[PDB]
Amino acid sequence: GISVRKRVIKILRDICIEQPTFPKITEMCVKMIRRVNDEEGIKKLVNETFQKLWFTPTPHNDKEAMTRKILNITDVVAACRDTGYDWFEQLLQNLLKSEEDSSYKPVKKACTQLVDNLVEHILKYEENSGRLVACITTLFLFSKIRPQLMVKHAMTMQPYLTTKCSTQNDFMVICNVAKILELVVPLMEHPSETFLATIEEDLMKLIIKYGMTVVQHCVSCLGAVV
DNA sequence: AAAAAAAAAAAAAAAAAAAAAAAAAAAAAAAAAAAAAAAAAAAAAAAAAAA
DNA sequence: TTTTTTTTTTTTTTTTTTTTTTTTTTTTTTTTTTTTTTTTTTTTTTTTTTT
């Protein structure tokens, strides 16, 4: 039906607003993102619900609550990583595209603040690694949907690319950061040539030391940058 | 004796028209939510008048 | 100069109306069947005409 859908989603919104730290939050987010493309009215309501639940300007005070929301989003994505990313990406298309006009640009500021604050969290991380790779993966998705949001920090992302370990999650770091570089390098405003030099050098160094899929997904980036 | 060609009514046959019916879809109505607009009211500000 | 009084603007609340959405019900044009009538065509005998 179309009634029942609206009613159950209303109940879910009240649940996720009122008494957080309930266990089943993540799954609720997974199901609601699963239903983003089904209809029209449902689409409008989920769009406005997600615009008020996460992507709000979040003024620069009480940063701990903001970090807790960040924890929420990272948990959601890291749990839905198994099935697929298509619904999330479609949702992101909807939220970004749906405001092409000036219209005070409410979301652009907030999203850029989410990515830079995640960068900063990554910075102070310094050394749970599942959460690290999940955050980098979230960075990857946010780059894929729109590349302008992650233009400034790629040179700061370079040191992770240089050396890493022989564990799976680390390999996921290597492939995802290569993917990000592939996505962002052509749009980077006036890069430095030595930066490209060391990029290409360690890319070859990575090729000569690791498995199949990582070699594939990095020589891809090599072809793109060349 | 012979013979050919043309008409007229009656008979068939296929296409179109006229009842008869069945089913999808447009319409209407009710409820109820969500929104929008208008009226009013409360507070803030800026000017004007007197001591 | 300062104190006291007036007026305009801004913003929030509320109430009535409007819009929306679904759902259920209804009644209508649409679609198919059957018939069946008409009209055209056909035939065959009759009539007309020719040798």
Side-chain angles (χ1 to χ4, degrees):
Chain A
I2 320 180
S3 86
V4 287
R5 196 164 309 122
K6 290 178 74 171
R7 190 54 48 82
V8 300
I9 191 54
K10 283 154 203 147
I11 292 314
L12 274 189
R13 179 251 313 267
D14 183 315
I15 280 291
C16 55
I17 277 178
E18 280 313 307
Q19 37 177 307
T21 68
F22 192 80
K24 302 284 183 292
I25 287 299
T26 88
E27 308 83 315
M28 291 317 106
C29 298
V30 165
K31 296 189 185 296
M32 68 204 290
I33 65 160
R34 167 73 40 59
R35 305 327 308 281
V36 300
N37 209 358
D38 54 1
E39 286 298 330
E40 174 44 43
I42 304 307
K43 169 178 291 285
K44 164 186 279 160
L45 63 75
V46 298
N47 277 270
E48 72 82 28
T49 288
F50 267 105
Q51 187 264 337
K52 182 254 287 182
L53 182 57
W54 293 339
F55 303 92
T56 175
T58 179
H60 321 86
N61 305 80
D62 196 339
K63 32 180 74 176
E64 62 188 2
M66 168 52 177
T67 64
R68 180 256 320 287
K69 169 188 289 196
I70 291 317
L71 198 57
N72 185 12
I73 282 177
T74 53
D75 272 296
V76 170
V77 59
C80 56
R81 186 258 314 282
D82 310 279
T83 72
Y85 296 160
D86 56 334
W87 328 109
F88 202 107
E89 303 184 27
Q90 171 67 42
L91 165 146
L92 293 181
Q93 269 281 8
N94 214 350
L95 57 92
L96 305 184
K97 163 64 191 66
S98 43
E99 277 69 30
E100 187 268 353
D101 206 69
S102 45
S103 46
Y104 190 49
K105 287 281 183 177
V107 293
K108 198 67 162 57
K109 269 302 181 180
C111 56
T112 311
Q113 177 181 345
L114 288 302
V115 56
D116 60 49
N117 205 315
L118 266 298
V119 170
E120 182 43 58
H121 188 103
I122 284 299
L123 274 196
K124 292 179 179 179
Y125 165 81
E126 186 196 4
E127 167 46 47
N128 196 38
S129 315
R131 308 316 301 235
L132 174 52
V133 55
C135 166
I136 301 151
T137 306
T138 300
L139 285 184
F140 163 58
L141 275 293
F142 270 114
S143 46
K144 174 141 60 174
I145 176 59
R146 261 213 80 181
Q148 272 61 25
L149 312 173
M150 292 182 71
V151 297
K152 312 170 304 293
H153 312 85
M155 285 83 77
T156 79
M157 306 307 181
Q158 206 269 5
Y160 306 143
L161 175 60
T162 74
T163 318
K164 274 308 105 173
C165 287
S166 162
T167 312
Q168 283 56 35
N169 44 9
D170 313 333
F171 294 155
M172 280 184 218
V173 189
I174 310 158
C175 54
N176 287 21
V177 300
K179 279 191 197 172
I180 303 153
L181 289 184
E182 194 277 342
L183 284 186
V184 296
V185 163
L187 270 173
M188 296 191 305
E189 268 71 13
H190 214 67
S192 159
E193 315 319 296
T194 175
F195 171 57
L196 181 150
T198 174
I199 281 158
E200 195 255 335
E201 281 145 38
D202 74 293
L203 277 181
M204 296 303 286
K205 293 194 315 184
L206 283 147
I207 289 152
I208 314 163
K209 207 181 159 56
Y210 289 107
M212 318 179 56
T213 68
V214 287
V215 159
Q216 159 63 271
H217 287 262
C218 64
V219 70
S220 62
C221 195
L222 175 137
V225 300
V226 301

